[PDB]
PDB file of C-alpha atoms and ligand atoms in Angstrom:
ATOM      1  CA  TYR T   1      -6.796 -34.655 -44.758  1.00 18.36           C
ATOM      2  CA  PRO T   2      -4.701 -35.987 -41.901  1.00 18.85           C
ATOM      3  CA  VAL T   3      -6.610 -38.918 -40.407  1.00 17.94           C
ATOM      4  CA  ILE T   4      -6.838 -39.531 -36.673  1.00 17.04           C
ATOM      5  CA  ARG T   5      -7.589 -43.224 -36.113  1.00 18.30           C
ATOM      6  CA  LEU T   6      -9.159 -43.483 -32.676  1.00 19.02           C
ATOM      7  CA  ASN T   7      -9.499 -47.223 -33.205  1.00 18.22           C
ATOM      8  CA  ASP T   8     -10.073 -49.771 -35.943  1.00 16.65           C
ATOM      9  CA  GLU T   9     -13.599 -48.545 -36.691  1.00 17.18           C
ATOM     10  CA  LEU T  10     -13.228 -44.832 -36.080  1.00 16.07           C
ATOM     11  CA  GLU T  11     -11.607 -42.073 -38.040  1.00 15.86           C
ATOM     12  CA  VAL T  12     -11.593 -38.310 -37.410  1.00 16.81           C
ATOM     13  CA  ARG T  13     -10.671 -35.620 -39.939  1.00 13.75           C
ATOM     14  CA  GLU T  14     -10.304 -31.936 -39.040  1.00 14.85           C
ATOM     15  CA  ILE T  15     -11.611 -30.548 -42.313  1.00 14.26           C
ATOM     16  CA  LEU T  16     -11.689 -26.907 -41.148  1.00 17.38           C
ATOM     17  CA  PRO T  17     -10.371 -25.346 -37.932  1.00 13.55           C
ATOM     18  CA  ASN T  18     -12.324 -26.985 -35.089  1.00 14.09           C
ATOM     19  CA  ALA T  19     -14.658 -28.883 -37.454  1.00 12.11           C
ATOM     20  CA  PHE T  20     -14.232 -32.655 -37.321  1.00 12.58           C
ATOM     21  CA  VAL T  21     -15.843 -35.225 -39.595  1.00 17.57           C
ATOM     22  CA  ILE T  22     -16.252 -38.477 -37.678  1.00 19.39           C
ATOM     23  CA  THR T  23     -16.307 -41.573 -39.888  1.00 20.23           C
ATOM     24  CA  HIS T  24     -17.479 -44.719 -38.150  1.00 16.81           C
ATOM     25  CA  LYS T  25     -17.207 -47.949 -40.112  1.00 16.31           C
ATOM     26  CA  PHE T  26     -19.767 -50.377 -38.864  1.00 15.17           C
ATOM     27  CA  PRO T  27     -19.163 -51.994 -41.239  1.00 13.12           C
ATOM     28  CA  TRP T  28     -20.014 -49.284 -43.801  1.00 11.45           C
ATOM     29  CA  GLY T  29     -18.494 -45.916 -43.310  1.00 10.98           C
ATOM     30  CA  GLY T  30     -20.933 -43.322 -42.027  1.00 12.15           C
ATOM     31  CA  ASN T  31     -20.263 -39.674 -41.203  1.00 10.73           C
ATOM     32  CA  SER T  32     -21.109 -37.341 -38.333  1.00 11.04           C
ATOM     33  CA  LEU T  33     -19.683 -33.929 -37.476  1.00  9.46           C
ATOM     34  CA  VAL T  34     -18.345 -32.210 -34.333  1.00  6.76           C
ATOM     35  CA  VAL T  35     -17.957 -28.405 -34.406  1.00  7.03           C
ATOM     36  CA  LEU T  36     -16.249 -26.773 -31.416  1.00  4.68           C
ATOM     37  CA  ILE T  37     -17.786 -23.407 -30.457  1.00  7.03           C
ATOM     38  CA  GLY T  38     -15.852 -21.149 -28.142  1.00  5.50           C
ATOM     39  CA  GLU T  39     -14.057 -22.901 -25.332  1.00  7.20           C
ATOM     40  CA  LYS T  40     -17.048 -24.475 -23.696  1.00  7.53           C
ATOM     41  CA  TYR T  41     -19.417 -25.826 -26.371  1.00  8.23           C
ATOM     42  CA  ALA T  42     -19.604 -28.330 -29.197  1.00 12.64           C
ATOM     43  CA  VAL T  43     -22.292 -29.244 -31.714  1.00 12.04           C
ATOM     44  CA  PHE T  44     -22.551 -32.885 -32.832  1.00  8.97           C
ATOM     45  CA  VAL T  45     -24.480 -33.473 -36.071  1.00  9.73           C
ATOM     46  CA  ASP T  46     -25.517 -37.091 -36.343  1.00  9.80           C
ATOM     47  CA  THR T  47     -23.678 -39.745 -34.390  1.00 12.51           C
ATOM     48  CA  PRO T  48     -21.663 -42.877 -35.003  1.00 11.99           C
ATOM     49  CA  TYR T  49     -23.505 -46.159 -35.382  1.00  9.56           C
ATOM     50  CA  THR T  50     -23.057 -47.144 -31.754  1.00  9.23           C
ATOM     51  CA  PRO T  51     -23.106 -45.573 -28.283  1.00  7.15           C
ATOM     52  CA  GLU T  52     -19.624 -46.938 -27.600  1.00  8.68           C
ATOM     53  CA  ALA T  53     -18.146 -45.276 -30.677  1.00  9.37           C
ATOM     54  CA  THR T  54     -19.981 -42.076 -29.766  1.00  9.65           C
ATOM     55  CA  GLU T  55     -18.459 -42.214 -26.277  1.00 11.99           C
ATOM     56  CA  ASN T  56     -15.010 -42.631 -27.828  1.00 13.08           C
ATOM     57  CA  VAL T  57     -15.554 -39.431 -29.821  1.00 11.85           C
ATOM     58  CA  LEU T  58     -16.916 -37.479 -26.846  1.00 14.12           C
ATOM     59  CA  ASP T  59     -14.001 -38.546 -24.628  1.00 10.16           C
ATOM     60  CA  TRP T  60     -11.425 -37.679 -27.273  1.00 12.39           C
ATOM     61  CA  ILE T  61     -12.890 -34.223 -27.929  1.00 11.74           C
ATOM     62  CA  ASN T  62     -13.125 -33.481 -24.203  1.00 11.06           C
ATOM     63  CA  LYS T  63      -9.559 -34.575 -23.538  1.00 10.87           C
ATOM     64  CA  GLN T  64      -8.075 -32.764 -26.545  1.00 10.56           C
ATOM     65  CA  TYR T  65     -10.102 -29.544 -26.334  1.00  6.44           C
ATOM     66  CA  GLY T  66     -11.447 -29.280 -22.776  1.00  8.86           C
ATOM     67  CA  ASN T  67     -14.749 -30.604 -21.437  1.00 12.48           C
ATOM     68  CA  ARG T  68     -17.598 -29.385 -23.634  1.00 11.97           C
ATOM     69  CA  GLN T  69     -21.306 -28.863 -23.236  1.00 16.04           C
ATOM     70  CA  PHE T  70     -22.473 -30.850 -26.277  1.00 13.87           C
ATOM     71  CA  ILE T  71     -25.650 -30.469 -28.300  1.00 11.66           C
ATOM     72  CA  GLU T  72     -26.605 -33.099 -30.856  1.00  9.59           C
ATOM     73  CA  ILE T  73     -28.789 -32.725 -33.945  1.00 10.23           C
ATOM     74  CA  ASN T  74     -30.108 -35.968 -35.494  1.00  7.81           C
ATOM     75  CA  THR T  75     -30.525 -35.521 -39.264  1.00  8.80           C
ATOM     76  CA  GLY T  76     -32.541 -38.717 -39.765  1.00  6.47           C
ATOM     77  CA  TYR T  77     -33.806 -41.751 -37.899  1.00 10.59           C
ATOM     78  CA  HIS T  78     -31.532 -44.401 -39.228  1.00 10.43           C
ATOM     79  CA  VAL T  79     -28.802 -46.113 -37.237  1.00 11.92           C
ATOM     80  CA  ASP T  80     -26.169 -44.089 -39.088  1.00 10.93           C
ATOM     81  CA  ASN T  81     -27.829 -40.871 -37.978  1.00 10.50           C
ATOM     82  CA  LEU T  82     -28.670 -41.639 -34.388  1.00 12.85           C
ATOM     83  CA  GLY T  83     -27.292 -45.018 -33.378  1.00 13.08           C
ATOM     84  CA  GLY T  84     -25.169 -43.322 -30.721  1.00 14.25           C
ATOM     85  CA  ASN T  85     -27.980 -41.322 -29.069  1.00 13.22           C
ATOM     86  CA  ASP T  86     -27.935 -43.426 -25.900  1.00 12.80           C
ATOM     87  CA  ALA T  87     -24.378 -42.290 -25.171  1.00 12.11           C
ATOM     88  CA  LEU T  88     -25.669 -38.726 -25.358  1.00  8.39           C
ATOM     89  CA  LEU T  89     -28.765 -39.455 -23.253  1.00  5.84           C
ATOM     90  CA  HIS T  90     -26.705 -40.877 -20.392  1.00 11.28           C
ATOM     91  CA  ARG T  91     -24.578 -37.710 -20.380  1.00 11.38           C
ATOM     92  CA  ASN T  92     -27.724 -35.508 -20.447  1.00 10.73           C
ATOM     93  CA  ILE T  93     -26.637 -34.074 -23.803  1.00  6.37           C
ATOM     94  CA  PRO T  94     -29.693 -32.560 -25.545  1.00  5.66           C
ATOM     95  CA  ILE T  95     -30.679 -34.395 -28.731  1.00 10.35           C
ATOM     96  CA  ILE T  96     -32.465 -32.179 -31.268  1.00 10.75           C
ATOM     97  CA  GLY T  97     -34.576 -33.820 -33.947  1.00 14.88           C
ATOM     98  CA  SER T  98     -37.852 -33.529 -35.780  1.00 15.38           C
ATOM     99  CA  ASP T  99     -41.237 -34.962 -34.885  1.00 17.00           C
ATOM    100  CA  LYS T 100     -41.047 -36.924 -38.164  1.00 19.98           C
ATOM    101  CA  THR T 101     -37.828 -38.562 -36.964  1.00 21.61           C
ATOM    102  CA  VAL T 102     -39.596 -39.546 -33.747  1.00 18.23           C
ATOM    103  CA  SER T 103     -42.569 -40.990 -35.658  1.00 18.86           C
ATOM    104  CA  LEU T 104     -40.393 -42.876 -38.144  1.00 16.79           C
ATOM    105  CA  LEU T 105     -38.222 -44.376 -35.405  1.00 16.15           C
ATOM    106  CA  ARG T 106     -41.345 -45.510 -33.556  1.00 15.10           C
ATOM    107  CA  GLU T 107     -43.063 -46.903 -36.657  1.00 14.45           C
ATOM    108  CA  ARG T 108     -40.108 -48.144 -38.747  1.00 14.60           C
ATOM    109  CA  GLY T 109     -37.123 -48.392 -36.382  1.00 11.19           C
ATOM    110  CA  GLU T 110     -37.256 -52.083 -35.617  1.00 13.28           C
ATOM    111  CA  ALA T 111     -38.204 -53.003 -39.164  1.00 14.02           C
ATOM    112  CA  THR T 112     -35.172 -51.080 -40.423  1.00 15.63           C
ATOM    113  CA  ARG T 113     -32.975 -52.846 -37.861  1.00 15.93           C
ATOM    114  CA  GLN T 114     -34.087 -56.180 -39.318  1.00 18.84           C
ATOM    115  CA  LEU T 115     -33.322 -54.946 -42.858  1.00 21.51           C
ATOM    116  CA  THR T 116     -29.872 -53.847 -41.682  1.00 21.18           C
ATOM    117  CA  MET T 117     -29.236 -57.189 -39.984  1.00 22.32           C
ATOM    118  CA  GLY T 118     -30.355 -58.975 -43.156  1.00 22.91           C
ATOM    119  CA  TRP T 119     -27.403 -57.409 -44.965  1.00 17.37           C
ATOM    120  CA  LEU T 120     -24.947 -58.564 -42.292  1.00 17.06           C
ATOM    121  CA  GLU T 121     -25.700 -62.293 -42.328  1.00 12.42           C
ATOM    122  CA  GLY T 122     -22.727 -63.194 -44.500  1.00 12.19           C
ATOM    123  CA  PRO T 123     -19.275 -64.462 -43.574  1.00  9.60           C
ATOM    124  CA  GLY T 124     -17.083 -61.847 -41.937  1.00  8.76           C
ATOM    125  CA  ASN T 125     -20.015 -59.687 -40.791  1.00  9.43           C
ATOM    126  CA  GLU T 126     -20.656 -61.626 -37.567  1.00  9.83           C
ATOM    127  CA  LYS T 127     -19.528 -58.952 -35.111  1.00 10.33           C
ATOM    128  CA  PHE T 128     -21.518 -56.240 -36.911  1.00  6.73           C
ATOM    129  CA  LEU T 129     -24.602 -58.451 -37.118  1.00  4.60           C
ATOM    130  CA  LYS T 130     -24.388 -59.116 -33.376  1.00  3.03           C
ATOM    131  CA  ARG T 131     -24.057 -55.492 -32.294  1.00  2.00           C
ATOM    132  CA  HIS T 132     -26.623 -54.131 -34.767  1.00  4.69           C
ATOM    133  CA  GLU T 133     -29.111 -56.453 -33.081  1.00  5.14           C
ATOM    134  CA  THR T 134     -28.432 -54.880 -29.664  1.00  7.36           C
ATOM    135  CA  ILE T 135     -27.856 -51.150 -30.331  1.00  8.88           C
ATOM    136  CA  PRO T 136     -30.464 -49.209 -28.307  1.00  8.63           C
ATOM    137  CA  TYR T 137     -32.595 -47.052 -30.611  1.00  9.43           C
ATOM    138  CA  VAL T 138     -33.235 -43.796 -28.726  1.00 13.70           C
ATOM    139  CA  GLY T 139     -35.000 -40.825 -30.299  1.00 12.56           C
ATOM    140  CA  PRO T 140     -34.413 -37.082 -29.927  1.00 15.64           C
ATOM    141  CA  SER T 141     -35.269 -35.353 -26.662  1.00 15.34           C
ATOM    142  CA  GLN T 142     -35.756 -31.756 -27.905  1.00 17.41           C
ATOM    143  CA  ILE T 143     -38.206 -31.988 -30.776  1.00 19.85           C
ATOM    144  CA  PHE T 144     -39.251 -29.493 -33.448  1.00 18.36           C
ATOM    145  CA  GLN T 145     -41.863 -29.624 -36.195  1.00 14.90           C
ATOM    146  CA  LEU T 146     -40.137 -31.007 -39.309  1.00 18.86           C
ATOM    147  CA  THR T 147     -41.421 -28.498 -41.855  1.00 20.07           C
ATOM    148  CA  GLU T 148     -40.774 -25.544 -39.529  1.00 20.16           C
ATOM    149  CA  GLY T 149     -37.080 -26.239 -39.161  1.00 20.06           C
ATOM    150  CA  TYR T 150     -35.211 -24.897 -36.167  1.00 20.19           C
ATOM    151  CA  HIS T 151     -32.905 -21.922 -35.549  1.00 19.16           C
ATOM    152  CA  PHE T 152     -30.897 -21.516 -32.357  1.00 16.51           C
ATOM    153  CA  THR T 153     -27.620 -20.122 -31.082  1.00 16.66           C
ATOM    154  CA  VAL T 154     -24.869 -21.825 -29.201  1.00 18.72           C
ATOM    155  CA  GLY T 155     -22.506 -19.531 -27.429  1.00 20.20           C
ATOM    156  CA  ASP T 156     -23.598 -16.585 -29.564  1.00 18.60           C
ATOM    157  CA  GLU T 157     -23.118 -18.541 -32.797  1.00 19.19           C
ATOM    158  CA  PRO T 158     -26.169 -19.232 -34.877  1.00 13.84           C
ATOM    159  CA  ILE T 159     -27.098 -22.666 -36.165  1.00 13.77           C
ATOM    160  CA  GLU T 160     -29.826 -23.403 -38.729  1.00 15.31           C
ATOM    161  CA  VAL T 161     -31.740 -26.674 -39.217  1.00 15.28           C
ATOM    162  CA  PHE T 162     -33.604 -26.868 -42.524  1.00 14.37           C
ATOM    163  CA  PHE T 163     -35.931 -29.401 -44.136  1.00 12.67           C
ATOM    164  CA  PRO T 164     -35.679 -29.088 -47.957  1.00 14.04           C
ATOM    165  CA  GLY T 165     -38.326 -31.677 -48.861  1.00 16.62           C
ATOM    166  CA  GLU T 166     -38.266 -35.479 -48.758  1.00 15.67           C
ATOM    167  CA  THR T 167     -35.039 -37.041 -49.957  1.00 12.77           C
ATOM    168  CA  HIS T 168     -33.357 -40.218 -48.795  1.00 14.82           C
ATOM    169  CA  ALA T 169     -35.892 -40.492 -45.973  1.00 17.36           C
ATOM    170  CA  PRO T 170     -38.988 -38.393 -45.254  1.00 18.64           C
ATOM    171  CA  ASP T 171     -37.241 -36.735 -42.283  1.00 16.35           C
ATOM    172  CA  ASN T 172     -33.818 -35.834 -43.615  1.00 17.15           C
ATOM    173  CA  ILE T 173     -32.679 -32.366 -42.676  1.00 22.22           C
ATOM    174  CA  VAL T 174     -29.497 -30.348 -43.158  1.00 21.52           C
ATOM    175  CA  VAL T 175     -27.605 -28.302 -40.555  1.00 18.15           C
ATOM    176  CA  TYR T 176     -25.996 -25.015 -41.598  1.00 17.44           C
ATOM    177  CA  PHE T 177     -23.370 -23.040 -39.652  1.00 16.53           C
ATOM    178  CA  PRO T 178     -23.624 -19.553 -41.239  1.00 16.79           C
ATOM    179  CA  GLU T 179     -20.520 -18.260 -39.434  1.00 20.48           C
ATOM    180  CA  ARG T 180     -18.451 -21.132 -40.864  1.00 21.97           C
ATOM    181  CA  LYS T 181     -20.170 -21.799 -44.213  1.00 22.42           C
ATOM    182  CA  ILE T 182     -20.365 -25.483 -43.261  1.00 22.61           C
ATOM    183  CA  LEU T 183     -23.403 -27.480 -44.398  1.00 20.49           C
ATOM    184  CA  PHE T 184     -24.013 -30.960 -42.995  1.00 20.02           C
ATOM    185  CA  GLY T 185     -26.125 -32.569 -45.709  1.00 17.82           C
ATOM    186  CA  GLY T 186     -26.175 -36.115 -44.402  1.00 20.24           C
ATOM    187  CA  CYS T 187     -27.833 -38.933 -46.278  1.00 17.80           C
ATOM    188  CA  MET T 188     -29.562 -36.785 -48.830  1.00 19.39           C
ATOM    189  CA  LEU T 189     -26.133 -36.100 -50.385  1.00 17.97           C
ATOM    190  CA  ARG T 190     -24.211 -38.747 -52.322  1.00 17.79           C
ATOM    191  CA  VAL T 191     -20.586 -39.426 -53.071  1.00 16.71           C
ATOM    192  CA  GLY T 192     -20.114 -41.545 -56.192  1.00 14.33           C
ATOM    193  CA  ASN T 193     -22.829 -42.496 -58.673  1.00 15.34           C
ATOM    194  CA  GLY T 194     -25.391 -44.341 -56.552  1.00 15.71           C
ATOM    195  CA  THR T 195     -28.405 -43.399 -54.454  1.00 14.93           C
ATOM    196  CA  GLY T 196     -27.812 -45.913 -51.696  1.00 13.01           C
ATOM    197  CA  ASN T 197     -30.680 -47.795 -50.095  1.00 11.03           C
ATOM    198  CA  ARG T 198     -34.006 -46.493 -51.312  1.00  9.98           C
ATOM    199  CA  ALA T 199     -36.409 -48.189 -48.897  1.00  9.22           C
ATOM    200  CA  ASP T 200     -37.372 -44.849 -47.484  1.00  7.41           C
ATOM    201  CA  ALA T 201     -36.542 -42.606 -50.403  1.00  8.86           C
ATOM    202  CA  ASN T 202     -38.824 -40.259 -52.339  1.00  9.07           C
ATOM    203  CA  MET T 203     -37.431 -40.357 -55.864  1.00  8.05           C
ATOM    204  CA  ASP T 204     -40.065 -37.824 -56.975  1.00 10.43           C
ATOM    205  CA  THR T 205     -38.863 -34.996 -54.682  1.00  5.58           C
ATOM    206  CA  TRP T 206     -35.242 -35.845 -53.818  1.00  3.10           C
ATOM    207  CA  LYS T 207     -33.579 -33.958 -56.667  1.00  4.31           C
ATOM    208  CA  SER T 208     -35.742 -30.846 -56.297  1.00  2.00           C
ATOM    209  CA  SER T 209     -35.119 -30.823 -52.540  1.00  2.24           C
ATOM    210  CA  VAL T 210     -31.343 -31.032 -52.962  1.00  3.69           C
ATOM    211  CA  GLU T 211     -31.485 -28.270 -55.567  1.00  2.00           C
ATOM    212  CA  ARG T 212     -32.721 -25.965 -52.795  1.00  2.67           C
ATOM    213  CA  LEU T 213     -29.370 -26.409 -51.045  1.00  3.62           C
ATOM    214  CA  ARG T 214     -27.706 -24.337 -53.785  1.00  3.01           C
ATOM    215  CA  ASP T 215     -28.763 -21.220 -51.857  1.00  3.69           C
ATOM    216  CA  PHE T 216     -26.488 -22.023 -48.909  1.00  4.63           C
ATOM    217  CA  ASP T 217     -23.111 -20.280 -49.042  1.00  4.92           C
ATOM    218  CA  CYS T 218     -20.777 -23.219 -48.432  1.00  2.15           C
ATOM    219  CA  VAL T 219     -17.046 -23.767 -48.071  1.00  2.00           C
ATOM    220  CA  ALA T 220     -17.563 -27.354 -46.926  1.00  4.31           C
ATOM    221  CA  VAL T 221     -20.437 -29.827 -47.289  1.00  5.09           C
ATOM    222  CA  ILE T 222     -20.673 -33.100 -45.347  1.00  4.55           C
ATOM    223  CA  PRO T 223     -22.388 -36.066 -46.963  1.00  6.01           C
ATOM    224  CA  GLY T 224     -23.667 -39.038 -44.977  1.00  4.00           C
ATOM    225  CA  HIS T 225     -21.215 -41.473 -46.485  1.00  5.59           C
ATOM    226  CA  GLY T 226     -17.882 -41.064 -48.206  1.00  4.95           C
ATOM    227  CA  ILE T 227     -14.816 -38.915 -47.692  1.00  5.52           C
ATOM    228  CA  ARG T 228     -15.595 -35.903 -49.849  1.00  5.83           C
ATOM    229  CA  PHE T 229     -16.429 -32.507 -48.387  1.00  5.83           C
ATOM    230  CA  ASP T 230     -16.138 -29.897 -51.148  1.00  2.83           C
ATOM    231  CA  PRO T 231     -19.336 -27.993 -52.043  1.00  3.54           C
ATOM    232  CA  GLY T 232     -19.348 -29.859 -55.368  1.00  2.00           C
ATOM    233  CA  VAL T 233     -20.849 -32.798 -53.467  1.00  2.00           C
ATOM    234  CA  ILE T 234     -24.132 -30.915 -53.892  1.00  2.00           C
ATOM    235  CA  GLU T 235     -23.835 -30.919 -57.673  1.00  2.00           C
ATOM    236  CA  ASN T 236     -22.695 -34.529 -57.721  1.00  2.00           C
ATOM    237  CA  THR T 237     -25.826 -35.452 -55.778  1.00  2.00           C
ATOM    238  CA  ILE T 238     -28.053 -33.538 -58.206  1.00  2.00           C
ATOM    239  CA  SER T 239     -26.275 -35.186 -61.150  1.00  2.00           C
ATOM    240  CA  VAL T 240     -27.047 -38.716 -59.902  1.00  2.00           C
ATOM    241  CA  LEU T 241     -30.718 -38.213 -59.000  1.00  2.00           C
ATOM    242  CA  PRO T 242     -33.563 -38.628 -61.535  1.00  2.00           C
TER     243      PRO T 242
HETATM  244 ZN1  LIG Y 301     -30.343 -44.022 -44.206  1.00  2.00          ZN
HETATM  245 ZN1  LIG Y 302     -29.672 -46.379 -22.267  1.00  2.00          ZN
HETATM  246 ZN1  LIG Y 303     -26.991 -43.086 -44.508  1.00  2.00          ZN
END
């Protein structure tokens, strides 16, 4: 895909008309998604690691495509899912997420920050270590019951939020755009051969939960990390889980 480099840490790829995968490297690359709906709306699935990077994305979208009423959906509680929530909060952008995400952020958020910082103590990681210490951890503001999921419409277009079972973290959910056959899978989907960090993972249910995603009719599937968006990401994920 053509790559728009907003800055040194931020890349944007228009993978389908009006669907943008945002890759923020901080220092690892993590993905979020902006889908423009009509002329007035936009849905943001996940955020970049930081409020400042999230602001850069919001400003770029607004300037390129007209000011949008944004809605965000957090697909987990980690810094790569919601690290930019404060940028949304200060713009009064609704942040949708599950009650499990709220509980996990409250109970595990600071502990996970320390784990993240512990990986950034080496030479060359100084600027990331510093900012990861100070990123404000802000939870969702419009909360649904995890196992119920959530269905809503934005400008007449339906959006579906589905919990398939515990995967990478007990709260991971996927977001499906039926009118576009786009599935944001997030951190439950893997590019390459590894699982990633397993501190919060349920290795007993992860594969069977991802197998449920086979029922979505997909043209594009967004994983949490990595630049690969074909629906075969789902099978790759299944192939690497036990
Ligand atoms: Zn994670
Ligand atoms: Zn704030
Ligand atoms: Zn992740």
